[PDB]
Write an enzyme that holds these catalytic residues in place. Structure first.
Site, mmCIF file in Angstrom:
data_model
loop_
_atom_site.group_PDB
_atom_site.id
_atom_site.type_symbol
_atom_site.label_atom_id
_atom_site.label_comp_id
_atom_site.label_asym_id
_atom_site.label_seq_id
_atom_site.Cartn_x
_atom_site.Cartn_y
_atom_site.Cartn_z
ATOM 1 N N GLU A 7 -127.675 -41.257 -38.344
ATOM 2 C CA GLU A 7 -128.818 -41.642 -39.155
ATOM 3 C C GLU A 7 -129.186 -40.481 -40.066
ATOM 4 O O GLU A 7 -129.601 -39.424 -39.565
ATOM 5 C CB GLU A 7 -130.000 -42.023 -38.267
ATOM 6 C CG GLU A 7 -131.247 -42.445 -39.022
ATOM 7 C CD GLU A 7 -132.350 -42.925 -38.098
ATOM 8 O OE1 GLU A 7 -132.056 -43.204 -36.916
ATOM 9 O OE2 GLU A 7 -133.509 -43.021 -38.551
ATOM 10 N N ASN B 104 -141.632 -35.303 -25.840
ATOM 11 C CA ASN B 104 -140.613 -34.292 -26.105
ATOM 12 C C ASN B 104 -141.056 -32.923 -25.605
ATOM 13 O O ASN B 104 -140.239 -32.145 -25.103
ATOM 14 C CB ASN B 104 -140.299 -34.243 -27.600
ATOM 15 C CG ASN B 104 -139.775 -35.561 -28.130
ATOM 16 O OD1 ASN B 104 -139.215 -36.366 -27.386
ATOM 17 N ND2 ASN B 104 -139.958 -35.790 -29.424
ATOM 18 N N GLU C 67 -124.001 -24.322 -8.526
ATOM 19 C CA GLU C 67 -124.554 -24.440 -7.182
ATOM 20 C C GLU C 67 -125.455 -25.661 -7.070
ATOM 21 O O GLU C 67 -125.396 -26.396 -6.079
ATOM 22 C CB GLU C 67 -125.316 -23.170 -6.811
ATOM 23 C CG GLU C 67 -125.854 -23.170 -5.391
ATOM 24 C CD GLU C 67 -124.758 -23.301 -4.351
ATOM 25 O OE1 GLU C 67 -123.650 -22.773 -4.581
ATOM 26 O OE2 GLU C 67 -125.005 -23.935 -3.303
#
Lengths: 440, 427, 440
Positions: free
Chosen positions: C72, C229, C255
């Protein structure tokens, strides 16, 4: 056993809680900001108190642990406008958009039970934050059926939740002469059975007696609900004086449970406070401690619309504030026993408990109070409570004869069977109380 | 593929395209002499999309205007926005089609279709990012309904991949001056269903009703209706052009707004629709626009929610709107309009938001729906055709044209097949 | 091997990456413009970062190695308007000339790999520039089908390229009630197919729960995508703080990967972070990390539409940022063992991967959550995601039976067998999680 959870239910209960928090701030000299207020004492908090009602935070700001619950948004907005809301946590208070009913229909109904789980998890989180617990304090008026039903639901949920701490409930009783609410006796009678099933200890106070006191003792022309709130705040502070401030004879809540419950079912203590008078007369008159003990037996100080002479004496306690001489109160209680004002029983008779606290009584500026270095708060178990119960039950039965309103209750959440059951429970309680008082 | 071409033909579609360009230059702010006035960067991109960077920073909108009367091009030249145009941008022939679709696309259309297709091929060579082709013509008039239909057919043959936005105007059943109007309309749509993939139902009577209920105009004027349809057409393209929380493209609708390719008709609705002088009383909120969208009185197709069953719906918004508000409104309308909302989706919703505020408004919204009320208009136009050519009046004209009645029966049967598709899917 | 490469796919993924780089620069005291500002300032150098994510130029400039891929052009212009594009290199950001489809049917098609070739040679050149790699980071959304398709394809390609480094894919999950695109069920199923192709670790997050938290905890009337966000930036910063800053308990990313997968196949662990409260409420509360842990276990602090109280307990990791006391975490694990709410699996039961970061947590000023000196992040495996996948699969199977969009799909280049196999893979993953919950 170092924390006591207080709950404010209903409009009158919320106002009483506000008054008690304000008075607790005034005694320790606590301002709206605080941070303790400020940090110099020892014993204004810390140490205890405040460690019984005000939650200690990492910053040190003492948060008064209170849960203001009501379905009336106006009262919630009012209590949020003041600095008390800043003192409390915004999540502790609960808000409702539409009032339950007028007054006990929905307050005890499942709609009032929807927020039960919410307030229960709130209480659980609050207990997880703090450390230890001594009991659960309740503040709701028996006149307001909404507050009555909500408080009974909370008490049942707490009994089913922990059942390890003594459940305290301060109940406000309407005037036996006039009742503004028509279902008020119905709500009170229906709530009595719930409190009998749930509450470990009760508190019965009459508004009309408070009004007569402030008109007579304080010599005021115009009574106010704020003055009643201030007097009940002074009472409640007199109850927990030893738990907040250290004294020569520190008393425990379990001691109250032992003294006020000398039988399988005895949890109805009457409250008396003396000396109470206008501040001007307090500056003009200076009585002795024996006069204060005698005034404790007066019908006015008992905060009940019943004569204490017809009542029969049982195990009583007397808390004292400020400086108090042990020999003097011993002489006073011996003189009182010699007077035989209230008729004594054969089980209890030597049942006058004495507790001393160093914290002197404080007089609020809104409501006058007899400025004295030492105060006397007598919690008695006289048998005038049965008289008040019968007084309200006669009107309850006279109503329930025709009852004029049963359709609303049987359609919303109730039935005539529940009313008859509560009536029979109240009658059985009155009969048992008269029996245990009369066998002496 | 942000560049989109616009084609204008017919007696009224010319004014429709004129108003469309008026709204285009008014949205960002532009002079009618090709002088740039937008700020700052996006407006140049939308110019490259619609206009052409001519000499001296000039800008001329890419539009193909064609009609059988040069008075129309004279009149649109008389307007401020659109006065100047390259002579190749518009070719006009003579003289008239006699309100006949067959004659229109047979004689009046074939002699100029070559030149206009050469022109549009030149501009397609010039415009690399072409995606869609907006179309402004009139289905009522035989001239427009024939010429534009032939042009859309030729473009579909030439550009099968490019989109085809058809904003034609359905005829009004009240008008009975010329009975050949609905007949030409149905003959045009019988081919445009395959020639065009995106069509929008527009009734003249719906426009008259909405301007008499909101604008409260005494006599129907094409000016305000063209302003409204131009605003609606500009909103759906600025949803992609102007930055927003979610832009919408023609391919997005072609893959989402329609379940099966045989459907190409899209109902229309615009908001806010405030009465003249009551703008002070009105306050732009989400619930009022939500209520407006689901009312037949506010639609211009105009299909009735209560009559036709909803296959799918879509509501696009402009300005500052919250996703939570529109989500709550959609949940409420799904709970209350579950009867029209079909069960096999089961939840039909397509949303697009434009961040910038609309031209002269704080928020503006458009609405599209696919309901089972368009088949009612199909039945009406078929009954019109049958009852009109049962009398065999004026049919000598079409015998002279050379068309056969077998083709007419085939067209009507295909329309009935489309109705049955809209009855599968029963109403 | 210490370096970490992040990828930004789709519109939502690019916005999330923008917020992440913003918070990154905000924590290390770096301005969004560059040069510097300032440092490489105590300890913004070693221990890296900022040299793990922020490659240092010869002049001291710290460029974040991020690839913003999206077909886009609007999102490319948006990320170019910001100053981080100036901070970024123009070769780092990949502009999309035309969107594949709406939105996944062509994104995962050949049109995707046409640009995937370019982005892969760019990634090879970048790896030649900066040597060492700890794990591949991915940011995209399931709502934007182009983002999901391109991210899944690039993840598969790079796993076929190296396969030795871990893969951390952040995918935004749509709410089960709202569907902004009716194409999204198919896209989610085909993306589950690609995860079954390659999935080292995938993070599930629903915008609905985050918006509810902003409305309730952050007191936001209309939560913005920017706040979401920012919260994602906060959680990913807390995750990467173990490698960015110094800590008594520093845990490798590999880990984490091996701890989350004790079984032959585990790909989808749920995340949760705390505290997330209002600024004024943060000023009102000064709780310890124990209450933060107790709140993170609740479904509210999960930021996803899944209840951990419902699903059974599996191997989880508790990361802590800021001032941490060993007594605090011991009391926390004691209270957790005292909870006994969720069912523990037979292999894990006493399993909590404890990680400590000395750096205090940091929040953006735009976010309504005040920055806290202490934070707890719980990442656990739960079977509620299986229920969410089952609901999504019911919807996708209904749509597949209606076969309306399957025509458009086979026009795009899809097959019936492909969707059948994707459905089979989704059902297999659901049954696998059901069985590993039943093995408890």
């Amino acid at each position: 056993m170092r924390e006591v959870i207080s709950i404010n239910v209903g409009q009158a209960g919320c106002q009483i809680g506000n008054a008690c928090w304000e008075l607790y701030s005034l005694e320790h000299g606590i301002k709206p900001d605080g941070h303790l207020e400020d940090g110099l004492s020892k014993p204004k908090g810390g140490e205890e108190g405040f460690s019984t009602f005000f939650h200690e935070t990492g910053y040190g700001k003492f948060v008064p642990r209170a849960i203001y619950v009501d379905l009336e948004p106006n009262v919630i907005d009012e209590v949020r406008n003041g600095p008390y809301k800043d003192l409390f946590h915004p999540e502790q208070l609960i808000s409702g958009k539409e009032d339950a009913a007028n007054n006990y229909a929905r307050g005890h109904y499942t709609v009032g039970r929807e927020i039960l789980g919410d307030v229960l998890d709130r209480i659980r989180k609050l207990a997880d934050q703090c450390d230890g617990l001594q009991g659960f304090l309740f503040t709701h008026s028996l006149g307001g059926g909404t507050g009555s039903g909500l408080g009974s639901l909370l008490l049942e949920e707490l009994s089913a939740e922990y059942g390890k701490k003594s459940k305290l409930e301060f109940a406000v009783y309407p005037a036996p002469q006039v009742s503004t609410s028509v279902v008020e006796p119905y709500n009170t009678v229906l709530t009595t059975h719930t409190t009998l099933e749930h509450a470990d200890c009760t508190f019965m106070v009459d508004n009309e007696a408070i009004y007569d006191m402030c008109k007579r003792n304080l010599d005021i022309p115009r009574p106010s609900f704020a003055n009643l709130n201030n007097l009940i705040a002074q009472v409640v502070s007199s109850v927990t004086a030893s738990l907040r401030f250290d004294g020569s004879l520190n008393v425990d809540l379990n001691e109250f449970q032992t003294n006020l419950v000398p039988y399988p079912r005895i949890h109805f203590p009457l409250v008396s406070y003396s000396p109470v008078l206008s501040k001007s007369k307090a500056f003009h008159e200076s009585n002795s401690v024996s006069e204060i003990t005698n005034a404790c037996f007066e019908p006015g100080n008992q905060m009940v619309k019943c004569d204490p002479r017809d009542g029969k004496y049982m195990a009583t306690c007397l808390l004292y504030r400020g400086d108090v001489v042990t020999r003097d109160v011993q002489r006073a209680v011996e003189q009182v026993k010699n007077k035989k004002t209230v008729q004594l029983v054969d089980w209890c008779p030597t049942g006058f408990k004495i507790g001393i606290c160093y914290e002197p009584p404080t007089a609020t500026p809104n409501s006058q109070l007899a400025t004295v270095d030492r105060a006397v708060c007598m919690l008695s178990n006289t048998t005038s409570i049965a008289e008040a119960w019968k007084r309200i039950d006669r009107k309850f039965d006279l109503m329930y004869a025709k009852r004029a309103f049963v359709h609303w209750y049987v359609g919303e959440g109730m039935e005539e069977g529940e009313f008859t059951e509560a009536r029979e429970d109240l009658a059985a309680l009155e009969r048992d109380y008269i029996e245990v008082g009369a066998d002496s | 593929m942000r560049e989109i071409i616009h084609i204008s033909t017919g007696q009224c579609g010319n004014q429709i395209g004129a108003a469309f360009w008026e709204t285009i230059c008014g949205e960002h702010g532009l002079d009618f002499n090709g002088t740039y006035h937008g700020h700052d960067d996006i407006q140049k991109e939308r110019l490259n999309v619609y206009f052409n960077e001519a000499s001296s920073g000039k800008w001329v909108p890419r539009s193909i205007n064609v009609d059988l009367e040069p008075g129309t091009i004279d009149a649109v030249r008389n307007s401020a926005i659109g006065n100047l145009f390259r002579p190749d941008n518009y070719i006009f022939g003579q003289s008239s089609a006699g309100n006949v679709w067959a004659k229109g696309h047979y004689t009046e259309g074939a002699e100029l279709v070559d030149s206009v297709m050469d022109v549009i091929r030149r501009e397609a060579e010039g415009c690399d990012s072409l995606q869609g082709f907006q179309i402004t013509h009139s289905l009522g008039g035989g001239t427009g309904s024939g010429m534009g239909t032939l042009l859309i057919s030729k473009i579909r043959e030439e550009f099968p991949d490019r989109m085809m936005a058809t904003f034609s105007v359905l005829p009004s059943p009240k008008t009975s001056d010329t009975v050949v109007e609905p007949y030409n309309a149905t003959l045009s749509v019988h081919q445009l269903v395959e020639h065009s993939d995106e069509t929008f139902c527009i009734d003249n009577e719906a426009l008259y009703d909405i301007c008499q209920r909101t604008l409260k105009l005494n006599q129907p004027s094409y000016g305000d209706l063209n302003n409204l349809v131009s605003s609606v057409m500009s909103g759906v393209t600025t949803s992609l052009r102007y930055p927003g929380q979610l832009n919408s493209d023609l391919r997005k609708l072609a893959v989402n707004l329609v379940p099966f390719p045989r459907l190409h008709f899209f109902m229309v609705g615009y908001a806010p629709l405030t009465a003249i002088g009551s703008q002070s009383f009105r306050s732009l909120t989400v619930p009022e626009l939500t209520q407006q969208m689901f009312d037949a009185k506010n639609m211009m197709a105009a299909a009735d929610p209560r009559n036709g069953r909803y296959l799918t719906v879509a509501a696009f918004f402009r300005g500052k709107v919250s996703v939570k508000e529109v989500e709550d409104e959609m949940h409420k309308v799904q709970s209350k309009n579950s009867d029209y909302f079909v069960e096999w989706i089961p939840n039909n919703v397509q949303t697009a938001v434009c961040s910038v505020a609309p031209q002269g408004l704080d928020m503006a919204a458009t609405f599209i729906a696919n309901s089972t009320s368009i088949q009612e208009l199909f039945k009406r136009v078929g009954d019109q055709f049958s009852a009109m050519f049962k009398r065999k009046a004026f049919l000598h004209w079409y015998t002279s044209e050379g068309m056969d009645e077998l083709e007419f029966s085939e067209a009507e049967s295909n329309m009935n097949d489309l109705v049955s598709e809209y009855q599968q899917y029963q109403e």
